[PDB]
């Protein structure tokens, strides 16, 4: 009954294992000896964005690389002007336990959500001059971990109900469901072309999804514990995952293996946030150490440390033009590093 | 020109910061409570007694109380999965986690060990190491019946109960069977054995026994919250 299908599944797993092993001739760790290192990365806190009252859970840059949305457990989304440190908007939320926030790439909407199992879409451009809830996306049966705007009318959310979902905002109806994780899906990362995204879950695995097909394209293992953070290499052909096993890993979609493992014996704290610089040479990772380690993404060496937060670094965001790194922490502060 | 937009931004920022000052005044003045427990633990009882003085569609249930004009927002985490390790660290600045235990659901037949293990997870979570836990041992009305009638058999799943006697500081209600108070304070001492092993003065357990008709829980948490706050303040001055 069950055993035939379980053994067929393990045969397919071994086929995956051997198809993986046959491709493992020489990965980044030996190819990239021929490049000189990044050296020491000395970033400084140009701006500190104060105004949140609780731990900041999520943070998202605009596509103008100037406006930031930041979610704190106040039930507040603050739209900051990162250049002048001015708050552009302060949006009170109907639920204070917000775990994610997204800034629409058009700049007109901001998403948020969390333990309320609802993705609230706020309109930042109304005729009243007021920011009001444009939509509420309900249908997830677990907390909202990550929401990313695919455009003004489509948002991808990940939930603690082990699924992801593509929502048509204008209708409010969940258009696609991405099932296949066993644990809570903690993070989303949309590829630059937006045709794919990648979701890391509490099953210690990441899954590459095709948005328009609703199909799990690939599954990446190699992490030992919960995957808290995921982000795409700027070309969309690789992604990094930060996990609670105190390790970051870079996987390539085409090779279908982990290419690089960023770890250090003095690092026993999990990785909460993972971001790539514009070039993809620097991998920024926020830690439970309260610091953000900047890794040589090709050498797997620590290029630098963004220390200065007084609590858990919860959210990382590199601007789309690469100019700055916003880090938000449980110490209620955002810091712009450059 | 640029100074015009800068002055407009300063005006917006000043309005926002006034609203944020009012919101900080409201936020600091509010105690946030997490409500945790098993399904049969009687958290419905706790929320009912708090409000007096397939049904859960939202992932969070905020119920607000006012005790001595002190505002409390208690958040029942309904409509979530039984895997808590990721959304529990969301309540790491909450004033207290109110951990309601199905003490009489034991003979599941081992709800009590499940509650003990969840409790040990909550103490030793590095994000909840500063979070105090108000412990409500919730179902004395059935604990009495199963203990005195030979229905509980606490010794069956907790053999050291066979060597446990009522402690020197117990205050049983008049006429209560000594074995029932043995079971009560034995369960409380199991939870305190978990608590004391790793407290180190950062966070505290406030164990309490309650029942279906015990409304004063709304005050117990209040009292405990006050205690919590004071200890926090006493740590800021290094007095305690």
């Amino acid at each position, epitope marked *: 009954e069950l055993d035939q299908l379980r053994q067929e599944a393990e045969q397919l797993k071994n086929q995956i294992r051997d198809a993986r092993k046959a491709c493992a001739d020489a990965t980044l760790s030996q190819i990239t000896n021929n490049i000189d290192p990044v050296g020491r990365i000395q970033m400084r806190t140009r701006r500190t964005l104060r105004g949140h009252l609780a731990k900041i859970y999520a943070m998202h840059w605009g596509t103008d690389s100037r406006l930031l949305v930041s979610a704190s457990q106040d039930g507040k989304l603050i739209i900051w002007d990162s250049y002048t440190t001015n708050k552009v908007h302060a949006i009170p939320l109907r639920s204070s336990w917000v775990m994610t926030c997204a800034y629409a790439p058009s700049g007109n909407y901001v998403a948020c959500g969390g333990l309320d199992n609802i993705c609230s879409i706020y309109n930042l451009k109304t005729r009243e001059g007021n920011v009001r809830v444009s939509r509420e996306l309900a249908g997830h049966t677990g907390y909202l971990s990550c929401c990313r705007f695919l455009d003004d009318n489509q948002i991808v959310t990940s939930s603690g109900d*082990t699924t992801c979902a593509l929502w048509d905002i204008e209708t409010g109806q969940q258009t696609t469901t991405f099932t296949g994780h*066993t*644990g809570d899906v903690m993070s989303l990362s949309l590829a630059p072309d937006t045709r794919l995204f990648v979701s890391g879950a*509490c*099953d*210690a695995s990441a899954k590459l999804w095709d948005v328009r097909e609703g199909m799990c394209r690939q599954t990446f*293992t*190699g992490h*030992e*514990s*919960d995957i808290n953070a995921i982000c795409f290499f700027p070309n969309g052909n690789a992604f990094a995952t930060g996990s*609670d*096993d*105190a390790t970051c890993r870079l996987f390539d979609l085409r090779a279908d293996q982990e290419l690089m493992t960023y770890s250090h014996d003095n690092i*026993i704290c*999990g990785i909460t946030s993972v971001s790539f610089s514009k070039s993809g040479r620097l991998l920024l990772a926020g830690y439970d150490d309260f610091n953000c380690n900047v890794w040589d993404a090709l050498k797997a060496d620590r290029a630098g440390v963004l220390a200065g937060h007084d609590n858990r670094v919860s959210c990382l965001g590199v601007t789309d033009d690469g100019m700055a790194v916003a880090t938000g922490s449980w110490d209620s502060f955002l810091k712009i590093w450059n | 020109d640029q100074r015009n937009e800068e002055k407009a931004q300063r005006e917006a920022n000043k309005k926002i910061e006034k609203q944020l000052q009012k919101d900080k005044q409201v936020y600091r003045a509010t105690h946030r409570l997490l409500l945790l427990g098993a399904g049969e633990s009687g958290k419905n009882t706790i929320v009912k007694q708090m409000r007096i003085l397939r049904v859960l569609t939202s992932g969070i249930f905020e119920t607000k109380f006012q005790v001595d004009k002190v505002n409390f927002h208690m958040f029942d985490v309904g409509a979530q*999965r*039984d*895997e*808590r*390790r990721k959304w*529990i660290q969301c309540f790491n600045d909450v004033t207290a986690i109110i951990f309601v235990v199905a003490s009489s659901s034991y003979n*599941q*037949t*081992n709800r009590l*060990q*499940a509650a003990l*293990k*969840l409790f*040990d*997870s*909550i*103490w*030793n*979570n*590095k994000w909840l190491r500063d979070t105090s836990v108000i412990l409500f041992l919730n179902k004395q009305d059935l604990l009495a019946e199963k203990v005195l009638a030979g229905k509980s058999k606490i010794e*069956d*799943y*907790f*053999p*050291e109960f066979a060597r446990y006697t009522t402690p020197e500081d117990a205050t049983p209600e008049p006429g209560e069977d000594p074995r029932v108070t043995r079971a009560k304070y034995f369960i409380r001492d199991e939870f305190l054995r978990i608590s004391t092993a*790793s407290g180190d003065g950062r966070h505290y357990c406030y164990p309490h026994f309650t029942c279906a008709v015990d409304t004063e829980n709304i005050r117990r948490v209040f009292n405990d919250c006050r205690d919590i706050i004071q200890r926090m303040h006493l740590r800021q001055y290094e007095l305690l």
Partner: nanobody
Amino acid sequence: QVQLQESGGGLVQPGGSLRLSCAASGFTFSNYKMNWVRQAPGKGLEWVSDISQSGASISYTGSVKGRFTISRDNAKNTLYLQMNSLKPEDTAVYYCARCPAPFTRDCFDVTSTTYAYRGQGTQVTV
């Protein structure tokens, strides 16, 4: 790839003994607190026994104290549970579980329905 495989189960007579062995792969076995979970027939999952990273701290559910003995081998990356004086109420599916994060003492979600870092389980019938 976290993979835990239990072995050493089967049918035993009441009062007998069984050595349950848990082969771990895909993670640093010594970094993690390990434990044994029990799914009784018709019941939910229940936790049986904790062992820490080094094996110094060992805890049991009261139903199995003095009868079950849990041990580690961080050299072979294996977890053992020696069952003595096995009773009919010990008949269940036994799962070797790894609690989710390394270098921690909290071990949330180990007895959850859909916990990931838990084996397929072995049937032990008494």
